[PDB]
């Protein structure tokens, strides 16, 4: 289930993902996303597991969900799950 996802590397991760995410991850990750990943791993390593973690400031709608950053929310409280990984973020104004 999730142990293999969290241990296995990025090329087999894109193989798991659709070819859309394969193309995206091959062509670009960039400094913004790498710094975002470092921030999220620090926040998840410091925040208590007994409470769900905090959202990501400097919000963006084009960050792909990767199992190596579990727990995060956005600042619209849907949690990014293993069934959420390939759908990107979205989560914007849709109020009826």
């Amino acid at each position: 289930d999730l142990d293999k996802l969290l241990d296995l590397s990025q090329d087999e991760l894109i193989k798991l993902f659709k070819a859309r995410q394969r193309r995206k991850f091959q062509r670009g990750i960039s400094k913004k996303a790498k710094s975002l990943l470092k921030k999220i791993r620090k926040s998840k390593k410091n925040c208590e597991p007994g409470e769900k973690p905090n959202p990501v400031p400097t919000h963006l709608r084009n960050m792909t969900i990767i199992p190596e950053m579990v727990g995060s929310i956005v600042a619209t409280n849907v949690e990014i799950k293993p069934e959420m990984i390939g759908y990107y973020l979205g989560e914007f104004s849709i109020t009826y």
Partner: protein, 128 residues
Amino acid sequence: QHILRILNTNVDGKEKVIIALTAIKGIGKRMATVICKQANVDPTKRAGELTTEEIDNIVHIMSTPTQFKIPDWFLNRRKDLKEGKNIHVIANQLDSYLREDLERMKKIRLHRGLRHHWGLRVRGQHTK
């Protein structure tokens, strides 16, 4: 002769054999076509002389055609992202797993899922 009944209606007595095979399920005609080819049933005949042996050959072909040459890409519902792998699961159970994926996307609850729940098309029906 005519009027032989299966899990799905096969009133196609006068109807030609291939369209009779397609009408029961896979109304896109083409997985029915590949099942017809694998079971190797001739087209010159009609559906009035279809044998129960031929029906059993159809259902044996349909039961996991992956062991046959039928390509992974030509397989309906190729990935259906999970730990396992899925397949064309025949009419009633195909709709059952359609419900399965539908409830999974409900608990996904994204823009398009809530759009459908609110009663709209995905790309935008453009009622404007």
